[PDB]
Amino acid sequence: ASMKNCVIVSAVRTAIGSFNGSLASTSAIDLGATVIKAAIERAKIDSQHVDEVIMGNVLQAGLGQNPARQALLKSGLAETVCGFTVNKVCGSGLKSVALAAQAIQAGQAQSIVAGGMENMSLAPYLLDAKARSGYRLGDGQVYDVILRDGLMCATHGYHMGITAENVAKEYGITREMQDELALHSQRKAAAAIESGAFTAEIVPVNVVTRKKTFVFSQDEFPKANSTAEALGALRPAFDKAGTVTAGNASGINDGAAALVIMEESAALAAGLTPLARIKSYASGGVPPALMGMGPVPATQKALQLAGLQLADIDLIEANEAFAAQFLAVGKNLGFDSEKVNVNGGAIALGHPIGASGARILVTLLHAMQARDKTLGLATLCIGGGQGIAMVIERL
Amino acid sequence: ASMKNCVIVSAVRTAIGSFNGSLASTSAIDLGATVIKAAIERAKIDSQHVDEVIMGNVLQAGLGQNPARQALLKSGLAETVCGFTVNKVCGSGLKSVALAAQAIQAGQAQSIVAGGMENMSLAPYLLDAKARSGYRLGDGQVYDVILRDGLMCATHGYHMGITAENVAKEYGITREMQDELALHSQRKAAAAIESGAFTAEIVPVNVVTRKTFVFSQDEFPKANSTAEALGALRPAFDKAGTVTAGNASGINDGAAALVIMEESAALAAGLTPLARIKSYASGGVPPALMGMGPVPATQKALQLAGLQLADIDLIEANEAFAAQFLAVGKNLGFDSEKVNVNGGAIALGHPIGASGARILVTLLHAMQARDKTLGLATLCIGGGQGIAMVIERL
Amino acid sequence: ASMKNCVIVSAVRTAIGSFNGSLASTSAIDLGATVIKAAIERAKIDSQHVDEVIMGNVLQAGLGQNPARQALLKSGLAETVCGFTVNKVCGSGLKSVALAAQAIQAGQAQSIVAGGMENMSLAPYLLDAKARSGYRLGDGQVYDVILRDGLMCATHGYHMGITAENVAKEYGITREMQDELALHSQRKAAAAIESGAFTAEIVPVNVVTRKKTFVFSQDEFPKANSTAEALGALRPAFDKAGTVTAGNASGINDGAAALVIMEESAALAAGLTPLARIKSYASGGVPPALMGMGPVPATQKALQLAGLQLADIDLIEANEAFAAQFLAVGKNLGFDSEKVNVNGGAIALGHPIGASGARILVTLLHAMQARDKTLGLATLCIGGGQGIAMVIERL
Amino acid sequence: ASMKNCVIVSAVRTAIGSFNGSLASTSAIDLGATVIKAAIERAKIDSQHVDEVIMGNVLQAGLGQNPARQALLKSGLAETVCGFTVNKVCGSGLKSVALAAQAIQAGQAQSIVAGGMENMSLAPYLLDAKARSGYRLGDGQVYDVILRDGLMCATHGYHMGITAENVAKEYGITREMQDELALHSQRKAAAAIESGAFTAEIVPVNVVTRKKTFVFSQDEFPKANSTAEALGALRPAFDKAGTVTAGNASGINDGAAALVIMEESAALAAGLTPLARIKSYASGGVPPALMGMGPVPATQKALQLAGLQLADIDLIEANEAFAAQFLAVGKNLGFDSEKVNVNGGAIALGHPIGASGARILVTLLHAMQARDKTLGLATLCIGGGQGIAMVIERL
């Protein structure tokens, strides 16, 4: 057998909600179902021709057997359509797309929906280890699952924000550099929102509660009228002696994203329109303490697999979990800053952990289309000391 | 670019612990680290040549960021080695192997460790989102994660055991048929244990508490099981039903892993391929009938391999419930003598995220012991899926 | 030895907060300390002459050893002053005062502060004993203490509201009758508030939070938007086929009340001014299913012990936990509706369960003073099938 | 009106269970029902001539509306019989009896069942009170109700055991003194058990569970073959440099006790046999840090009210919550050790907090009968810095 080509046929995302914000009552699985259905619709594929659904999701606690399969079922897909759920932390949503592409390239499937989903506002709490056998006597604890499974380092026991401080120190990324980057992200996001740059990529969500009904269609994390002065006055969020603040880090957020990926000859034979070819993908490992540098080896490997140099890439989405690591990555790889996050990034837009990797890919494709660019790179760091990267080529 | 062949170079598992038994103080991730390291050792690969680690794990709650990655680091692999955690419920451990094989076949890696790990004893209890945003007024619930994320159907809200009842009714699988099958499994497992048939595949685990001892023998098998004792058991899930604790698997702890490699690269390194992965597939069925998942998965796997079922010499078909084991057999036409020759999960246990890899490890060793050529490993998956893999001994 | 006379020397309450409202950050014990201190101040007694403090409190869970004793200490009383906490559910605050009177009449004390305190907003949630001995396998429940220890029948396992439906059916109290009564309570309460009728009896509470700093002095439960039409449009709260709604029942509420009670000769010898003599008190029992009828036997007995007929009473406070039971009691006893709850009742004002019995007594005495009336009756029903009543005579 | 005389007509208790022991599946309320019914049977009163039931209960969390009233109903008393629940912490069970005597002396009742009940094994756990509005973000705690509501000082936030260390220091009570006292209590209890001395006072409890079925009739907390050597080897429980251990302090325990109390001339006219007259009672306050000294002012007051000197008392039950405080109280008052806790005390027998004050009164009465003594004193310390005492005259 010879390897096949894989293409993207559609790409969609929800608007990203704030913590306890507009999506705080909409399960991760319902957000996933929303983007799966929308990606199917927008691709104009026959929904009975979907071979698998692969979805990232990090905070799986309490969500029930295999969130990806629940989401595909809730989307309306037939019971015969398989799926599974991927946890590579912040990389989960892009890893899902990379696995879809691999399955297609390998001849194992022709059509897959892939992406990620996360609702952090609805993450649960855990009882301490004594609950099953009995607390007996004495107080106990309850553990926040966001922190335990999502935002704390399992190797070192400190917050991802501390890994960001480590990177800041190791690569000489100052508080002022981090705040300038943040303000840049805020400004680009505001301009993208105001110009309608995200209109094409966002599927609205109807939100119904006892109190109110409303349609959520605009990213709500951005901080209007951000200024260098307001940023410089914030206190550090993770260490009193540190540099990382709520203003130069992304947030806790809720959202989902998905893409239809298909074997190229099959998409063409079905009369569909390939939007981009997936050219390469790769993952990389680094020390957990320096997890924010994950994108460096992932990107190097991806570019090598694509037969490209970094300069060949027209547009880059590099996730902004923390300004500190965003900057250190860019400095190490030599990113042309004018090509990166042209519509703003996670500091403004948010970081729904299991969706973000797919979210950035969605934003990347649509930005390449708007600017008629040919080659794009999406990459992000991963808690536990990893990175993932993907290169796509517009058609 | 051309597709590559993938081979198994080693295969190992822990003994399977009972609920609150010998492995109940050993974290899933530590069990995973054990089997990763052992699989690497047994393969005689250079451990710096591992490209990725892929591990199944279902009850992820409270285990911390990306359990597979923690397990690979705890095994001693370098920080440059990537990994990720797979959740396809009961299929997770076999799915991980299938993903490893695929990555190899696709030229994206040369050497992967894959498998699965589960400690159901250590699964936590959970307060739902209301603990975070406020209960406000009125009662809430505290959820056993074993049930919520492992053993209850997310679509129907009832136990996997109820899906087994559905299957028993739909396919005419009686209580007596279920109990006969359970006794057979108990007998075969006891004979396998007694003859040393699991000795080659099991990596012992050192357990330290309190208690210091070595765990090396599967402890879920029920000594002196009888048709009479089984026939008297009360149904476990429905008072008018057929499924009991004696004709269903348990809640269990364990792990399993295999070294998978591109075939030319294994040979060039002077290693010994144990089997080639010939095909793999997944299938979807109604969640209410999830125990039937192996049927389409096996059909597809066999078709991908260019084989008929009769070509297969040995089969491992997981026994989550006798009801579904039997219905699956009837729908596929299994030769009962070729299936679960060393016993199955009714006797051995069902550590959910590991079981898919566990059966593969057991299959391969049984094929070696009996000098057989073709083997099939398959299992049902909560939520209405199945997975199957065919391997060919070298 | 001869029995002694007992008099009221002061009577005070907090304004009654709404659930999650103005008092929701002020602990029951701090509310109790506030009224204990104020009652002592208003009585003009030497505070070293207080022999005991007796406080009603129903939701004791998590409040620490003997809430009454914590309140007395927080009020500034010496550690030599004893106290204890009474739980007769809704009757607790009146029972505390009855006990104080009895102790004084029996020559066991000369001066006692009695009342009740409740913060329902701050009531905890609970894990039952399986948390201590171990869940083992399978789920458990997390119980709202308001419901478990306050508002659900321990005998029948249903809400107090269902007992109100039972009473509505048994005594033929219709939805319309209930709503007419509710509107009347709302109207009397609004007029009493507006005319200042509660100024003398209320002690203000200072409230400080991160968000707000303010003084709470006006009952906030009353519903300005009350009309027969709005009330008729409400859905039943407890039974879809029933009559009881949020509009014709009291609320979940926060508040406290206290009174200084003294032996009569001693109050006079100290140069203090008795406000009223406690003439009698009694408790009664009825079926838990019909607990709202508790006041009938309690009142009958209290009247007999006072040597009075119901027509001798000038003013009545009969608590309005539910219009259904308020009305059924009144019909049974033959209350002159113009003498009852002249400043409005709990449907408008609220029902902080362990305080309400003392609260109504405070309201009664001040209303008797305003109207120069001689004989008063305070009575209320009690979950679990009881009632309590007290008759007082102005001096 | 003139005061009346109050007599005890019956006195009964359960055996005391160990933590997680024989009574650990029998609710406090069911234990209370068992002693209420037995006390009524033993008194030979018409089985419905009860005016009120008054029960002590400290850990009321999650037990439902007014545990005393649930207990009286479960005992089979008619719904017309009133009841309430008392919380004066460790003093609750004796406080209930005192209140019953006061109501009778006051002419307000003729026949009351009073006592206390506690099941510490079944005490629940509490979520942080913020769970109602939400933990929001970050780890939290779960609180043991035994500790929060029973065993920790609400004023100082430390364990009753620490108050015991405070008293040991203040009054010079050494580890060796404490251990000698403990061994003495163990020995007396073992001899009392072996001689049948508790047989008359104990009501057996049938325990039926899925696992086990048996009759519980013998106190199970006593430690068989206690020695000075085993005691001297124990580690301190509450402070590493301290004196208080599991061997010289009481336990966490389950149990209940109740008495029928009646007006004297009416008991006689009914043909009943008074067992003792309640001669006096009182409560006292001390610093919470020194709560174990509570019995001193309570006992001084009770004796003064009875017109007696300490030396007139024939037998004393002084609770042994901690040897340290037991001894300090005895030294301060000058107790004749030969007259105190003649059948052993709580170090051997256990301390079911809301029951103990009634429990010791039951033991005192039966011991007076066995030794044909005339005057008895029952007293105990109370968390929060109180004490209570009662003097009885045989019968």
Curated annotation (Swiss-Prot), chains A, C, D:
The active site is at C90, H351, C381. GO terms for molecular function: acetyl-CoA C-acetyltransferase activity; identical protein binding. GO terms for cellular component: cytoplasm; protein-containing complex. It is found in: Cytoplasm. Belongs to the thiolase-like superfamily. Thiolase family. It catalyses: 2 acetyl-CoA = acetoacetyl-CoA + CoA. Its EC number is 2.3.1.9. This is Acetyl-CoA acetyltransferase. GO terms for biological process: acetoacetic acid catabolic process. InterPro entries: Thiolase, Thiolase-like, Thiolase_acyl_enz_int_AS, Thiolase_AS, Thiolase_C, Thiolase_CS, Thiolase_N. The gene is atoB. NCBIfam families: AcCoA-C-Actrans. Pathway: Metabolic intermediate biosynthesis; (R)-mevalonate biosynthesis; (R)-mevalonate from acetyl-CoA: step 1/3. Pfam families: Thiolase_C, Thiolase_N. Keywords: Acyltransferase, Cytoplasm, Fatty acid metabolism, Lipid metabolism, Transferase.
